[PDB]
Amino acid sequence: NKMLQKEKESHAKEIDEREKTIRDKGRRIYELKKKTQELEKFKFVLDYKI
Amino acid sequence: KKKAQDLEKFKFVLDHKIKELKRDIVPREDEITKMKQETNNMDQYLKE
């Protein structure tokens, strides 16, 4: 018991932080999706104006 | 990010020809011109 108590620990904070990183990278994914979408329409708009 | 990069120039540049075509038109419509002065002066010649 004493040796196993010395042994056992961890990885819950790591699970949560990895979920946090998933969250942040999904945030950036959608931000860049919106930026790309904003820039896409202007291409056809400017071709049409030309 | 790369798609937005490949689309930022598409959002900006063609404004270049947007301005260019109008600027070219600028001197183009202009020639409502000396042909009319000729028609006026030859009309004066007709008068006399």
Q: Is A25 exposed, middle or buried (0-12, 13-18, 19+ CB in 10 A)?
A: exposed
The experimental technique used to determine this model is cryo-EM
CB–CB contact B4 A32 (8 Å): yes
Between the alpha carbon of residue B37 and those of residues A14, B30, B32, the distances in Å are: 87, 14, 10
Whether B14 contacts chain A with CB within 8 A: yes
Whether B47 contacts chain A with CB within 8 A: no
Q: Shortest CA distance to A46 belongs to which of B12, B20, B22? A: B12
* Alpha helix positions (H), A1-50: 2-7, 12-49
